[PDB]
Design an enzyme around this catalytic site. Structure first.
Site, short mmCIF file in Angstrom:
data_model
loop_
_atom_site.label_atom_id
_atom_site.label_comp_id
_atom_site.label_asym_id
_atom_site.label_seq_id
_atom_site.Cartn_x
_atom_site.Cartn_y
_atom_site.Cartn_z
N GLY A 59 0.82 -1.22 0.00
CA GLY A 59 0.00 0.00 0.00
C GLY A 59 0.85 1.26 0.00
O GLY A 59 1.95 1.27 -0.55
N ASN A 83 -0.01 0.90 13.93
CA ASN A 83 1.44 0.88 14.13
C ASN A 83 1.92 0.22 15.43
O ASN A 83 3.08 0.37 15.82
CB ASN A 83 1.99 2.31 13.99
CG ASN A 83 1.75 2.89 12.61
OD1 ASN A 83 1.80 2.17 11.61
ND2 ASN A 83 1.49 4.19 12.55
N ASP A 126 6.95 1.45 12.82
CA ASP A 126 6.81 2.51 11.80
C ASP A 126 7.36 3.86 12.28
O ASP A 126 6.63 4.68 12.83
CB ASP A 126 5.36 2.64 11.30
CG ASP A 126 5.27 3.29 9.91
OD1 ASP A 126 6.11 4.14 9.56
OD2 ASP A 126 4.35 2.92 9.16
N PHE A 172 2.27 2.67 2.62
CA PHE A 172 3.44 2.29 3.43
C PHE A 172 4.58 1.64 2.63
O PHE A 172 5.75 1.77 3.01
CB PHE A 172 3.03 1.35 4.58
CG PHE A 172 2.40 0.05 4.14
CD1 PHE A 172 1.02 -0.06 3.96
CD2 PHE A 172 3.19 -1.08 3.92
CE1 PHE A 172 0.44 -1.26 3.57
CE2 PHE A 172 2.62 -2.28 3.52
CZ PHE A 172 1.24 -2.37 3.35
C1 LIG Z 1 -2.69 -3.53 10.24
C2 LIG Z 1 -1.95 -2.26 9.83
C3 LIG Z 1 -1.21 -2.40 8.51
O1 LIG Z 1 -1.64 -3.21 7.71
N1 LIG Z 1 -0.12 -1.65 8.19
C4 LIG Z 1 0.52 -0.64 9.06
C5 LIG Z 1 1.89 -1.22 9.49
C6 LIG Z 1 2.75 -1.69 8.30
C7 LIG Z 1 1.93 -2.50 7.27
C8 LIG Z 1 0.61 -1.80 6.92
C9 LIG Z 1 3.43 -0.48 7.64
N2 LIG Z 1 4.55 0.09 8.39
C10 LIG Z 1 5.37 -0.63 9.19
O2 LIG Z 1 6.30 -0.12 9.79
C11 LIG Z 1 5.07 -2.06 9.30
C12 LIG Z 1 5.80 -3.13 9.78
C13 LIG Z 1 4.98 -4.24 9.64
C14 LIG Z 1 5.29 -5.63 10.00
C15 LIG Z 1 6.54 -5.97 10.57
C16 LIG Z 1 6.76 -7.26 10.89
N3 LIG Z 1 5.80 -8.20 10.65
C17 LIG Z 1 4.59 -7.87 10.10
C18 LIG Z 1 3.55 -8.90 9.84
C19 LIG Z 1 2.23 -8.51 9.52
C20 LIG Z 1 1.25 -9.46 9.27
C21 LIG Z 1 1.55 -10.81 9.34
C22 LIG Z 1 2.84 -11.23 9.65
O3 LIG Z 1 3.16 -12.55 9.73
C23 LIG Z 1 2.82 -13.42 8.64
C24 LIG Z 1 3.83 -10.28 9.90
N4 LIG Z 1 4.37 -6.59 9.79
N5 LIG Z 1 3.82 -3.85 9.10
C25 LIG Z 1 3.82 -2.58 8.88
#
Ligand SMILES: */C=C/C(=O)N1CCC2(CC1)CNC(=O)c1cc(-c3ccnc(-c4cccc(OC)c4)n3)[nH]c12
Ligand SMILES: */C=C/C(=O)N1CCC2(CC1)CNC(=O)c1cc(-c3ccnc(-c4cccc(OC)c4)n3)[nH]c12
Lengths: 305, 305
Positions: free
Chosen positions: B27, B145, B158, B29
């Site tokens: 997205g 976040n 983030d 991000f």
């Molecule tokens: C739910 C919020 C979302 O979807 N976001 C905000 C955080 C997002 C991804 C989009 C963007 N910015 C970040 O810094 C970040 C870091 C992560 C992240 C790090 C480590 N692991 C995961 C993860 C997410 C879903 C499933 C798994 O395991 C399969 C791991 N996400 N995400 C963001």
């Protein structure tokens, strides 16, 4: 400029801020009270332990201990809240209601399962690895000096023998936890703390047995030089005992580092009944791809310097 | 000498050390993959997330984010393992398998009890208090976040908008989480992060509701100046909602500090059903003197600067 400046804060706490003070015990260590610290102008009551050594010589050594505790900050190392300046100086620490781990494992041996035993080994290794990063040699690691905040959370205590930058003078020492080089030559390193960690793990796995029970301290140096070591506990697999044996190598560089011990025990903590065989381990109660699963380690247990 | 030297280590990790790479999502991000980091000459497999922003401008802002993450070390703040120097730079972080907390609370709303909700508020406050000690303003605190390592353990993520020493330039911003002074005057402090924390707590207590749902971002500044705030969640007692309201004061100095929020929520976490009323709270499952008990706080939750 050999070493960086220590900007730790020494909090001096007023005697009027302490209430409900009761004695927990006393001995060679000194005296430990339990109490309640109420900071002035704050609606907060903090359970605290208050330690006094057993006057000029007592105040010197206790303030050396306050220096080390004021400089450390880690979840698996004991926290100094401050000091109280009475006639004899008092260390004010966090209360650890369940006491030391040695007494805990003796009292609850029927309810202690492999998951708790292996988790304690990881937490102790995390505390010691932190102390290595801070360049501190503990020089007194034992089951008696690991305190229990809750059954799930343990912390390392007692920095009376702690020293910076890992040769010691003569005195009264815990011979049965010391590395062979420390007994013979008075050499103390981070690798001498690993030997002590091995003996500490052996204490837990035997449910608080005394190491070399019956043998006097003067005979220990000659016993270790002959190649004799502490025996394999009944519950221990060859896997777990091999880690203890590796901690008791003559060559200090051949011993495992604390970061390696964190990794190894955390792998074992994911499948505890493969590594510790305890009678009635299922009903113990205290108050991803398949090929990868064996060598998997979480980032929080993979510690970079 | 205005500020102390940052001696944090930036680890550069080889592309050949990564395996089983799969896309998790993408997205504004950027893109986040899940993978397996296998360090060379070590029998260890580390579950990792790999983030790419959506080239010169992308590499600049991502390396600014790597700088902040490499400088932080706390159990409730996200850990950077290193960076990978491909055509576009990649941040390598710890895997948080259960995803972000906003998605978690929406998906498991029927199984989330008061104990978990209040514990998450404490852990988020501990992470933010750490960031205040490091002089970092997050500037993007929200339920999205906060990442879930396990249901019992959450971490703040983030740092794309993070800034040292808490006036910002113009851009695209999260208006609905920002303090009124940040919207009007572009002023960002640690007290502006407390406003965002209040909105983050409101997200959790409503089980992932969108704040000011239907209202466009341009109308938010005038709404807050009139005195309107987010409404009281059904499960929230007056006690919990009063803490949120205190986070949304016009005067930034009147808001609570993160250390005070740690204390207040940890008191509530000892008696959760007094402070949150949830239907069916008893059977929720996820994978001392009586007079003192009210104002009691553990030393680990009483944080001295
Ligand atoms: C739910 C919020 C979302 O979807 N976001 C905000 C955080 C997002 C991804 C989009 C963007 N910015 C970040 O810094 C970040 C870091 C992560 C992240 C790090 C480590 N692991 C995961 C993860 C997410 C879903 C499933 C798994 O395991 C399969 C791991 N996400 N995400 C963001
Ligand atoms: C079981 C070992 C033992 O009895 N020891 C060794 C540790 C001892 C006391 C004697 C000496 N040196 C220390 O550094 C130290 C610190 C503590 C301590 C700190 C905080 N809380 C306690 C405590 C012990 C038992 C019960 C409670 O709660 C009522 C608290 N102890 N002990 C030592």
């Amino acid at each position: 400029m050999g070493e960086a400046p220590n900007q730790a804060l020494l909090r001096i706490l007023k005697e009027t801020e302490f209430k409900k003070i009761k004695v927990l015990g006393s001995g060679a260590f000194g005296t430990v009270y339990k109490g309640l610290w109420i900071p002035e102008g704050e609606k907060v009551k903090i359970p605290v332990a208050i330690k006094e050594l057993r006057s000029p010589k007592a105040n010197k050594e206790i303030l050396d201990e306050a220096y080390v505790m004021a400089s450390v900050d880690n979840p698996h190392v004991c926290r100094l809240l401050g000091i109280c300046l009475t006639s004899t100086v008092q260390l004010i620490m966090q209360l650890m209601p369940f006491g030391c781990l040695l007494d805990y494992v003796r009292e609850h041996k029927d309810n202690i399962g492999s998951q708790y035993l292996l988790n304690w080994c990881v937490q102790i290794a995390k505390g010691m690895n932190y102390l290595e990063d801070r360049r501190l040699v503990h020089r007194d690691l034992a089951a008696r000096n690991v305190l229990v905040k809750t059954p799930q959370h343990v912390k390392i205590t007692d920095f009376g023998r702690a020293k910076l930058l890992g040769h010691a003078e003569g005195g009264k020492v815990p011979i049965k936890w010391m590395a062979l080089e420390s007994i013979l030559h008075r050499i103390y390193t981070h690798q001498s703390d690993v030997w002590s960690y091995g003996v500490t793990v052996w204490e837990l796995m035997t449910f608080g047995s005394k190491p070399y029970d019956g043998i006097p301290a003067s005979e220990i140096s000659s016993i270790l030089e002959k190649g004799e070591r502490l025996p394999q506990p009944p519950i221990c697999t060859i896997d777990v005992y091999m880690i203890m044996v590796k901690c008791w190598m003559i060559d200090a560089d051949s011993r495992p580092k604390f970061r390696e011990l964190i990794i190894e025990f955390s792998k074992m903590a994911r499948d505890p009944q493969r590594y510790l065989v305890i009678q009635g381990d299922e009903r113990m109660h205290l108050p991803m791809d398949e090929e990868d699963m064996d060598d998997v380690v979480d980032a929080d247990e993979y510690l970079i310097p």
